[PDB]
Design an enzyme around this catalytic site. Structure first.
Site, PDB file in Angstrom:
ATOM      1  N   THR A 237       0.435  -1.284  -0.353  1.00  0.00           N
ATOM      2  CA  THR A 237      -0.340   0.001   0.332  1.00  0.00           C
ATOM      3  C   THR A 237       1.365   1.207  -0.031  1.00  0.00           C
ATOM      4  O   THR A 237       0.487   2.226  -0.797  1.00  0.00           O
ATOM      5  CB  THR A 237      -0.828  -0.339   1.261  1.00  0.00           C
ATOM      6  OG1 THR A 237      -0.605   0.560   1.835  1.00  0.00           O
ATOM      7  CG2 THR A 237      -2.112  -1.360   1.462  1.00  0.00           C
ATOM      8  N   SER A 238       1.033   1.926   1.509  1.00  0.00           N
ATOM      9  CA  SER A 238       2.141   2.962   1.492  1.00  0.00           C
ATOM     10  C   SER A 238       2.018   3.776   2.979  1.00  0.00           C
ATOM     11  O   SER A 238       1.227   4.083   3.603  1.00  0.00           O
ATOM     12  CB  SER A 238       1.263   4.251   0.834  1.00  0.00           C
ATOM     13  OG  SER A 238       1.441   4.035  -0.656  1.00  0.00           O
TER      14      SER A 238
ATOM     15  N   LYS B 284      -2.841   1.616   9.873  1.00  0.00           N
ATOM     16  CA  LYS B 284      -1.917   0.758   9.932  1.00  0.00           C
ATOM     17  C   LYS B 284      -0.927   0.567  10.637  1.00  0.00           C
ATOM     18  O   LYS B 284       0.486   0.778  10.347  1.00  0.00           O
ATOM     19  CB  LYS B 284      -1.289   0.926   8.012  1.00  0.00           C
ATOM     20  CG  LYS B 284      -2.808   0.326   7.541  1.00  0.00           C
ATOM     21  CD  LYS B 284      -2.556  -0.169   6.216  1.00  0.00           C
ATOM     22  CE  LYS B 284      -2.118   0.594   4.691  1.00  0.00           C
ATOM     23  NZ  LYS B 284      -2.333   0.402   3.845  1.00  0.00           N
TER      24      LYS B 284
ATOM     25  N   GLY C  30       2.832   0.643  -2.876  1.00  0.00           N
ATOM     26  CA  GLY C  30       2.874   2.266  -4.126  1.00  0.00           C
ATOM     27  C   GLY C  30       4.048   2.721  -3.657  1.00  0.00           C
ATOM     28  O   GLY C  30       4.190   4.004  -4.661  1.00  0.00           O
TER      29      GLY C  30
END
Lengths: 243, 243, 196, 249, 243, 204, 198, 222
Positions: free
Chosen positions: C1-2, C33, C130
């Site tokens: 994700t990031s 997260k 990402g």
């Protein structure tokens, strides 16, 4: 001093196993129980020992138990030791039924049990079962059968046997009147006609008994097993020799 | 002829002295401790005797921090107490992990009074010769205090004492609580309560304390802390005049 | 994700989106997260879900059992308990995990435990599907030791593009600043990072 | 002393296991406790004794809930009872509720408990429990029930009975004022007048812990919507409910 | 008494004699001392040359744990090495888990908990040695001295063995005329001194001195053996003052 | 090859005014080969009935497993187990083997000797329970049954009409199922008296 | 597969079982006896996987015999087949299952009735008037559906069984090298060494 | 399978249809995805049937054992820690996704655990065949703070969007409302939008239609 009765793992200089003998001695402290063979049935009679005014006894039982739908036993001795066995005695009985898809033969069941009692007599850290048993049942191999087993692990088949208190008396009386063919309603007769004579209580009161029998014939091509109710007792008791 | 040697044998009067003797060892500590609860705090008191110019006192306590909210004081040998302190110190960690929330004082004490029971019935070891006093500020009972012993016992205390001087530190409190007719000390902040114990103890022992003769810890709204070395001198000063 | 965590003047800041996809569907669009295993020790989860979640659960457990007897643990310590689990089990775990913490002495440090339990301590790290896009920015726009704000507008522009080209990542930004001051929570809604 | 009473594995020349009787002594010592079976209920009670009033007795139960239809009490070694309890509440799930989708009848729990009581015996290396419990409850097919369980592992059913120091007579009192009819309120009465003579302390609402099995409490569930799930029969009276029944003797 | 035979058993006063006798065996071994300078510590043991046939410089009594912990004991020598190998695993697994070399205070419990244990079961013999050890961690240097019951604490410097009192009075002293951390170098020197003075109980049995130390400045965080020149100096710097 | 379709067979249950009916075919075959036409799928423990479909070797084993189990129950509680108390059992039972299941589809059905109310229930191989006030079907011709039952069923039929409705459902699905047939048998269970009947059907 | 036939008549059971044994390309034997007597009045034929086949047969035989001296009583056909189905039943869910199919045909001296049980490797048991394992059924089952009657004499059964074999020969691809027949009844087991000597 | 859950001011509410599948054929026309973990703690189970009903079973039983022993009402995160710790141990071979909801002496809670042990939190969750349907009826009509009746109206209007637009879900709606300081209310069928119209013919046969071969009266006892 110094004695050879400290455990089961020890033979006295004369090959005696005292610890086992003492257990065999614990039986003479139990309520009398009887078993009488008949040309058409088997009778189980016992005499509740424990007593007190406020002791529920019309529901629960203490001396007569169903092991198989065709086999019953009379207990005498250590209460707890009795259940431990009775249960396994029931499991084994069902595995035979589950494997051979037939019902388990009496002698086989009595032998299996005597064989466990035997074992607790030969291994250290174990205490033998302080129990005695009168097995009454029926199988297609040998019709009706009456068996007995003690703590030492031996078993045997009588035509009429008694275990418990005053066995000498109870045993004696039977040895006398037992007619080898004697019908059932004469055994149930002889049941009390013996239990009576060997009691203490001012009078033999119903609430102090346990009867059960095994009958069968042409009718139900199979065996009907009955465990008398407080009622039937208080009744059949009067029909004999009690006001 | 050795009842009292085995942790498993009952004397003719169901005693189990080994468990009993276990206790006297909880006294050869020669340290006294009382714990009282505030209205949003809880404080335990205990003397800090260091009989050697060589031992560096920093490493000389009988109160540890089980969890970030619970504190414990022990009336016994530093070896045995250090053990218990650890097991409980771990029950905490695991409990949280397995249930999502911080373990209550009242519970931890039951895990221990239980643990030191199985510890004592199966005979897998000798009973620890110490008394454990659990304090904290629960979120369902705040001022909480429970104390377990070697025989596997426990219960709640509105504020208790332990040492070679039970009754003194105790009765002295029974007469102070006999008045306030309530079951707790009234005060807005710990600082003041602390002062109440030292105060209400010197009274029972009959001796002055400095910044090294005592030792105290307290519990707040989830944040257990041990009283500093120098800081213990403080409240000792403040309450040396408001007599 | 990031996800990423950056070291600076006081200590460190770790942030990361909220988007968590299952296929091209968004199972949750506001995920946290950023798991905390201890007061000054936090981490940002990457990779599988269920796995990372349970690791943390454990890593936390240990530390909580550590302080309880060995005093408050360092940061290098925590990143060890983390790899121990990520190494011995590289076969049934998919974890991206980035660990960050602020220690009084050592300032604030950053370690990144990637697939394989290969541990690394860097100025800052960036993981998540990402991160592949902000390798240009991140590297070319990084000066050693920034300010509490001079940097928050970095994490903000990194996490900006991350969302802009990587579907599997988006939602709302989320920062946590670990400092001598303590823990601080930030959140910078869509109409904002897009604006840039 | 014998040379046979210090081994669970040993039979005396007559045939009496020893360690058991001494264990059974720690019981005949414990604080007095009784249980009375009614016709529409059952009552179980036991006294409380304070080490000192500095201790909070309201954080240590003596009448416990095993199943929402069964409760139990004791007389003998405190600590045993505490865990013998939690092991009973489990062997109640793992051994029945989790196999039959429902809670167990009185009779079988008492036997599942005597089963754990049995183990303590048959085996050197451990000591039996110094406790004796009165377990009371009710299940659909059997009506109400009353049972006693001793270290020996055996267990019996009574209508009414007592165990403890002041039992010889308490068990004598009851014997006199018991008959098949007593409604629960009567039992609750007859109990207090028997928990009466059996004390040297006092008779307040704290030093007395009594609970009873009776009618269902559609309030004590916490939810409502499912027809059959009606409620728990076990009710531990509160300090208040008590002393009120004490005034009317 | 029948209370001094088993290791688990409590005497009527909560006394475990078997552990006590353990101590009697400790205060009979050679003499071991432990000095805690400013940053780091110093250890020294008394080795006894029984005969001339004893290669010197060999048969070392001081063992390093990991690479930063000094470690010396007195009493049963085999029990010695033993208690240390455990310490060596306990150490290693700890560094393998957390990376950071084990905290001297942490280390002590590990050992206590272990020695602790040998007082719980009657199938084993309590450790027959008193141990002194320490090292420099993140919080500087620490110096502990564990004993046969698992009991232990932190010290400014201490020692056990046949001749310990002299070692103590001539030890408390150094504390009084230096209240502010001794000296890295100087510690060693005064160390070799404190042994001689204490050897006057083995006078007729020529001996060999062994010193090791650990210091953030001379060793550099690591524990090293005092051999070579500084080893001589310290001897004479003590042989001179012995006059 | 699906283990639950080598042997074949079907079972169906229904409820009526103070009664239940349970019926099944008789065929046991291997794949296409028909082996027997006297293979019954319905057993009973006391006043509780259980029909089982699926892999024959498991059907047999389960019967034995439950007979065994129920006999031990009766002996211990001094009473025969009830329909619900039993359903819960065969459910847990099936589940204890969640990762190597018996390949069956049981179906309990009886009358509660206390309440007096009719009961029928179904389960899938891992034990998921399923009560229904109208009907239960299980087997190879599973769908053909849902089609028949969702037409011919009628709340509160009289035992004499229930027999006709249930029979017709079974009869007709077994005709559109290639692995079910060779005869059938139906039971009509009341508080007391239980009547068993075999039906006449195509033998192809 | 091998050939395994069996048929119950008036007062006895008959078992047919091909004689050949083949390992790949060749025929190592044309006189193999797939039978194995469990007791004086119980007989059991088998056919299946190479090794599994007789290891199992003997195992079963050993258990029955043990039981028989122990009890001194002879286990009944019904109970014997029950035991077998139990074993095979446990077998199917074990590290490696025996792949064996069987036929048990004994004489119940208690009811004075012959009984024949057919069991397959999965634990599937069924009592039948006549049976067969494997492909053996498709070529015979119709002939027996046609002529079989429960009143048949032992003498009549053989004649019937002969027909089934003749059919097996005419339409089956494999050459099973003939069969060996055996009869079980009130007097025990004997071998019709005259279906071979013909 | 089509379940949701949404919390309001003094509690939380979850709803689930009642239709078990099994291929394209319907098995249960009136199932019950709503289970009780403890009085004020309930679950909604999607996915593999037996699994969810057997897992809640377990956890429930254990928590009952827990509170009793600790003498306090069951927290909701416990029930969560338990479930996902167990779910994980089995690397997803026990396909039970669900929505756990409840209220403990620390507020009201709502969670969603997937098969593998992953758990998430929000104010409204959807799990099942029609999760995307009832998640367009939640990402549209949702606002912070909602009356009890509003929350109930929304949750049951989500399920409905599942019933109609999804084939793997239908029949009735089931609801359970957990409110603080109050008992829980179980609403088996807060709705019944589907009710088969009446048939066009009576299909009862005249007695004696079916042909019988044998008859007899079997026994039961002894």
């Amino acid at each position: 001093s110094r004695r050879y009765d400290s455990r089961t793992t020890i033979f006295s200089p004369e090959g005696r196993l005292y610890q086992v003998e003492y257990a065999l001695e614990s039986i003479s402290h139990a309520g009398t129980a009887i078993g009488i063979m008949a040309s058409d049935g088997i009778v189980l009679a016992a005499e509740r020992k424990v007593t007190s005014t406020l002791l529920e006894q019309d529901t629960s039982t203490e001396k007569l138990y169903k092991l198989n739908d065709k086999i019953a036993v009379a207990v005498a001795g250590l209460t707890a030791d009795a259940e431990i066995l009775i249960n396994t005695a029931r499991i084994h009985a069902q595995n035979y039924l589950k494997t051979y898809n037939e019902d388990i033969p009496v002698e086989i069941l009595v032998r299996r049990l005597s064989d466990i009692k035997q074992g607790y007599t030969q291994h250290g850290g174990l205490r033998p079962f302080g129990v005695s048993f009168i097995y009454a049942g029926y199988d297609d191999r040998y019709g009706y059968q009456l068996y007995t087993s003690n703590p030492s692990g031996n078993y045997t088949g009588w035509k009429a046997i008694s275990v418990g208190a005053n066995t000498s008396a109870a045993q004696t009386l039977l040895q006398m009147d037992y007619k080898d063919d004697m019908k059932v309603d004469d055994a149930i007769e002889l049941a009390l006609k013996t239990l009576s004579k060997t009691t203490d209580s001012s009078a033999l009161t119903y609430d102090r008994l346990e009867f059960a029998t095994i009958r069968k014939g042409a009718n139900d091509g199979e065996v009907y097993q009955k465990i008398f109710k407080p009622q039937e007792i208080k009744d059949i008791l009067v029909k004999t020799g009690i006001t | 002829a050795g009842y009292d040697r085995h942790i498993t044998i009952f004397s003719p009067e169901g005693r189990l002295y080994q468990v009993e003797y276990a206790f006297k060892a909880t006294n050869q500590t020669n340290i006294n401790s009382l714990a009282v609860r505030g209205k949003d705090c809880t404080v335990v008191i205990s003397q800090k005797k260091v009989p050697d110019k060589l031992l560096d006192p920093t490493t000389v306590s009988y109160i540890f921090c089980i969890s970030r909210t619970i504190g414990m004081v022990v009336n016994g040998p530093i070896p045995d107490a250090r053990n218990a302190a650890l097991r409980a110190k771990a029950e905490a960690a695991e409990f949280r992990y397995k249930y999502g929330y911080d373990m209550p004082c009242d519970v931890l004490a039951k895990r221990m009074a239980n643990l030191s029971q199985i510890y004592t019935q199966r005979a897998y070891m000798r009973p620890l010769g110490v008394i454990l006093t659990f304090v904290s500020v629960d979120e369902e009972l705040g001022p909480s205090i429970y104390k377990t012993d070697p025989a596997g016992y426990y219960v709640g205390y509105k504020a208790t004492a332990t040492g070679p001087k039970q009754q003194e530190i105790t009765t002295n409190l029974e007469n102070h609580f006999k008045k306030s007719k309530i079951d707790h000390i009234n005060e807005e902040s710990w600082e003041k309560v602390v002062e109440f114990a030292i105060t209400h103890m010197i009274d029972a022992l009959g001796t002055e304390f400095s910044k090294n003769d005592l030792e105290v810890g307290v519990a707040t709204k989830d944040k257990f802390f041990t009283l500093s070395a120098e800081n213990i001198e403080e409240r000792l000063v403040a309450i040396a005049e408001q007599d | 994700t990031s996800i990423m965590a950056v070291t600076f003047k006081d200590g460190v800041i770790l942030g990361a989106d909220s988007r968590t996809t299952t296929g091209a569907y968004i199972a949750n669009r506001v995920t946290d997260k950023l798991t905390r295993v201890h007061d000054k020790i936090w981490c940002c989860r990457s990779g599988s879900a269920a796995d990372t979640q349970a690791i943390a659960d454990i890593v936390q457990y240990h530390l909580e059992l550590y302080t309880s007897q060995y005093g408050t643990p360092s940061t290098e310590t925590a990143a060890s308990v983390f790899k121990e689990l990520c190494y011995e089990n590289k076969d049934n775990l998919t974890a991206g995990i980035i660990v960050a913490g602020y220690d009084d002495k050592n300032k604030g440090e950053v370690y990144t435990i990637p697939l394989g339990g290969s541990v690394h301590k860097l100025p800052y790290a960036i993981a998540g599907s990402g991160s592949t896009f902000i390798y240009g920015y991140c590297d070319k726009n990084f000066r050693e030791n920034m300010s509490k704000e001079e940097t928050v507008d970095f994490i903000k522009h990194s996490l900006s593009q991350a969302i802009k080209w990587d579907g599997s990542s988006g939602g709302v930004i989320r920062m946590v600043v670990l400092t001598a001051a303590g823990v601080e929570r930030l959140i910078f809604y869509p109409d904002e990072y897009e604006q840039l | 002393t014998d040379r046979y009473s210090f081994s669970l594995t040993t039979f005396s020349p007559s045939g009496k296991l020893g360690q058991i009787d001494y264990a059974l002594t720690a019981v005949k010592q414990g604080v007095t406790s009784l249980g009375i079976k009614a016709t529409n209920g059952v009552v179980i009670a036991t006294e409380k004794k304070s080490s000192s009033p500095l201790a909070m007795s309201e954080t240590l139960s003596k009448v416990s809930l095993l199943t929402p239809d069964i409760g139990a009490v004791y007389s003998g070694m405190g600590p045993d009872y505490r865990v013998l309890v939690d092991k009973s509440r489990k062997v109640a799930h793992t051994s029945y509720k989790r196999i039959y989708g429902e809670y167990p009848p009185t009779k079988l729990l008492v036997s599942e408990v005597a089963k754990i009581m049995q183990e303590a015996t048959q085996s050197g290396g451990v000591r039996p429990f110094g406790v004796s419990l009165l377990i009371a409850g009710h299940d659909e097919f059997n009506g109400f029930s009353l049972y006693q369980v001793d270290p020996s592992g055996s267990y019996f059913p009574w209508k009414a009975t007592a165990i403890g120091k002041g039992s010889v007579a308490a068990k004598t009192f009851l014997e006199k004022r018991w008959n098949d009819e007593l409604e629960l309120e009567d039992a609750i009465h007859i109990a207090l007048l028997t928990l009466k003579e059996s004390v040297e302390g006092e008779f307040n609402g704290d030093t007395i812990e009594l609970a009873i099995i009776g009618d269902e409490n559609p309030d004590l569930l916490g939810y409502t919507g499912i027809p059959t799930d009606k409620g728990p029969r076990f009710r531990k009276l509160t300090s208040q409910e008590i002393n009120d029944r004490l005034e009317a003797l | 008494t029948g209370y001094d035979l088993s290791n688990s058993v409590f005497s009527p006063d909560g006394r475990n004699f078997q552990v006590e006798y353990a101590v009697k065996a400790v205060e009979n071994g050679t003499t071991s001392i432990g000095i805690k300078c400013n940053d780091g510590v110093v250890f020294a043991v008394e080795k006894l040359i029984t005969s001339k046939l004893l290669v010197p410089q060999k048969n070392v009594k001081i063992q390093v744990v990991d690479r930063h912990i000094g470690c010396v004991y007195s009493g049963l020598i085999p029990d010695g090495r033993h208690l240390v190998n455990r310490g060596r695993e306990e150490a290693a697994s700890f560094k393998k888990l957390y990376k950071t070399p084990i905290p001297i205070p942490a280390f002590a419990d590990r050992l206590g908990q272990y020695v602790q244990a040998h007082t719980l079961y009657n199938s084993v013999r309590p450790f027959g040695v008193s141990t002194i050890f320490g090292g420099v961690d993140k919080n500087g240097a620490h110096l502990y001295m564990l004993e046969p019951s698992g009991s232990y604490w932190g010290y400014k410097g201490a020692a056990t063995g046949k001749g310990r009192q002299s070692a103590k009075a001539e030890l408390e002293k150094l504390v009084d005329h230096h209240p502010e951390g001794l000296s890295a170098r100087e510690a060693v020197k005064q160390a070799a001194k404190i042994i001689y003075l204490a050897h006057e109980d083995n006078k007729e049995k020529d001996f060999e001195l062994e010193i090791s130390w650990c210091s953030l400045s001379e060793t550099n965080g690591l524990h090293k053996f005092v051999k070579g020149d500084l080893l001589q100096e310290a001897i004479d710097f003590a042989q001179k003052e012995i006059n | 090859s699906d283990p639950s379709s080598i042997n074949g067979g079907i079972v169906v249950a229904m409820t009526g005014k103070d009664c239940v009916a349970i019926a099944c075919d008789l065929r046991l075959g291997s794949q296409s080969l028909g082996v027997s036409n006297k293979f019954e799928k319905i057993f009973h423990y006391g006043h509780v009935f259980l029909g089982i479909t699926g892999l024959a070797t498991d059907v047999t084993t389960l019967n034995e497993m439950f007979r065994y189990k129920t006999n031990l129950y009766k002996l211990k509680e001094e009473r025969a187990i009830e329909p619900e108390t039993f359903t819960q059992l065969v459910s847990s039972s099936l589940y204890e083997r969640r990762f190597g299941p018996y390949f069956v589809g049981p179906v309990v059905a009886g009358i509660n000797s206390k309440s007096g109310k009719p009961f029928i229930a179904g389960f899938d191989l891992i034990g998921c329970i399923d009560e229904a006030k109208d009907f239960i079907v299980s087997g190879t011709a599973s769908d053909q049954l849902f089609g028949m039952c969702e037409s011919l069923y009628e709340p509160n039929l009289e035992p004499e009409d229930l027999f006709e409705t249930i029979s017709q459902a079974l009869l007709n699905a077994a005709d559109r199922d290639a692995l079910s047939g060779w005869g059938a048998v139906v039971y009509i269970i009341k508080k007391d008296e239980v009547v068993k009947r075999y039906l006449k059907m195509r033998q192809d | 597969m091998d050939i395994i036939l069996g048929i119950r008549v008036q007062d006895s059971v008959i078992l047919a079982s091909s004689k050949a044994v083949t390992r790949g390309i060749s025929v190592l034997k044309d006189s193999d006896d797939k039978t194995r007597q469990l007791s004086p009045h119980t007989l059991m034929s088998f056919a299946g996987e190479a090794g599994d086949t007789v290891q199992f047969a003997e195992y079963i035989q050993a258990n029955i015999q043990l039981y028989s001296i122990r009890e001194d009583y002879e286990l009944s056909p019904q109970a014997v087949s029950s035991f077998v189905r139990q074993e095979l039943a446990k077998s199917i869910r074990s590290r490696r299952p025996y792949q064996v199919n069987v036929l048990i045909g004994g004489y119940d001296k208690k009811k004075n009735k012959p009984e024949l049980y057919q069991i397959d490797y999965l634990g599937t048991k069924v009592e039948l008037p006549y049976g067969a394992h494997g492909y053996s059924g498709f070529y015979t089952f119709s002939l027996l559906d046609h002529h079989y009657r429960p009143d048949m004499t032992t003498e009549e059964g053989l004649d019937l069984l002969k027909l089934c074999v003749q059919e097996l020969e005419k339409r089956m691809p494999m050459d099973f090298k003939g069969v060996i027949v055996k009869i079980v009844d009130k007097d025990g087991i004997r071998q019709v060494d005259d279906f071979q000597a013909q | 399978t089509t379940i949701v859950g949404v919390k309001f001011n003094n509690g939380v509410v979850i709803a689930a249809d009642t239709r078990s599948t099994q291929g394209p054929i319907v098995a249960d026309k009136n199932c019950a995805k709503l289970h009780r973990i403890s009085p004020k703690i309930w679950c909604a189970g999607a996915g593999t049937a037996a699994d969810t009903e057997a897992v809640t079973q377990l956890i429930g039983s254990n928590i009952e054992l827990h509170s009793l022993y600790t003498s306090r009402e069951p927290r909701v995160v416990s029930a969560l820690q338990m479930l996902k710790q167990h779910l994980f141990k089995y690397q997803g071979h026990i396909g039970a996704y669900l929505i756990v909801a409840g209220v403990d002496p620390t507020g009201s809670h709502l969670f969603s655990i997937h098969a593998h042990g992953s758990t998430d939190v929000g104010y409204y969750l959807s799990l099942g065949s029609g999760s995307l349907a009832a998640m367009a009826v939640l990402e549209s009509h949702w606002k912070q703070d909602l009356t009890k009746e509003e929350a109930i109206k929304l949750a049951s209007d989500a399920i409905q969007a599942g019933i109609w637009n999804d084939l793997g879900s239908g029949s009735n709606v089931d609801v359970c409302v957990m409110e603080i300081g109050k008992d829980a209310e179980y609403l088996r069928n807060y709705l019944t939008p589907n009710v088969r119209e009446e048939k066009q013919k009576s299909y009862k046969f005249p007695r004696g239609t079916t042909a019988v071969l044998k008859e007899s009266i079997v026994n039961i006892c002894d």
